[PDB]
Write a protein that binds this ligand. Structure first.
Ligand SMILES: [Cl-]
Ligand SMILES: [Cl-]
Ligand SMILES: [Cl-]
Length: 163
């Protein structure tokens, strides 16, 4: 575990993280994809061997000794709000299991289903709260990665408000 487990947010490419493992915002088929998924494919292409996994699940594949946790959030263009909410919460619970199993002291995480899987909606609060529900019981240092200055502010505000 981390000595004083924390949440932080950084506005940069998750492919350049300083953590002991990464969570990919994966598609169910293990394809190179778009956004976070494409950056992860470019940095850790070896981790996409047999990475295909259903919606609401996480599957870890090693790139050397560096763990890539492929977490499949729902595409809100295909799911109802209620079923999408359930699968988004489930993907994060599976991430918490994997981070625990791996025994890492830190993990780089993106906000699942906030990009091209968002169904054109702002899901910062929804996705972040499911992240907290899952990761709060873990003792890893969590570093959230985003690309927007205003999302960075909102995420930083939500972290600080609970401390
Ligand atoms: Cl960057
Ligand atoms: Cl997404
Ligand atoms: Cl963002």
């Amino acid at each position: 575990g981390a000595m004083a487990p924390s949440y932080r947010v950084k506005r940069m490419d998750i492919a350049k993280n300083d953590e002991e493992c990464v969570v990919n915002a994966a598609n169910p088929r293990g394809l190179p994809g778009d956004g976070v998924c494409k950056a992860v494919y470019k940095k850790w292409p070896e981790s996409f061997k047999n990475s295909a996994t259903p919606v609401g699940t996480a599957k870890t594949v090693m790139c050397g000794t560096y763990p890539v946790i492929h977490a499949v959030g729902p595409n809100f263009s295909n799911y109802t709000e209620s079923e999408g909410d359930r699968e988004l919460a489930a993907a994060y619970r599976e991430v918490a299991k994997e981070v625990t199993r791996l025994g890492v002291n830190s993990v780089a995480i993106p906000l699942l289903s906030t990009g091209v899987y968002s169904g054109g909606k702002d899901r910062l609060t929804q996705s972040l709260n499911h992240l907290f529900t899952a990761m709060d019981s873990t003792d890893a240092d969590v570093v959230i990665y985003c690309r927007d200055k205003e999302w960075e502010k909102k995420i930083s505000e939500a972290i600080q408000m609970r401390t």
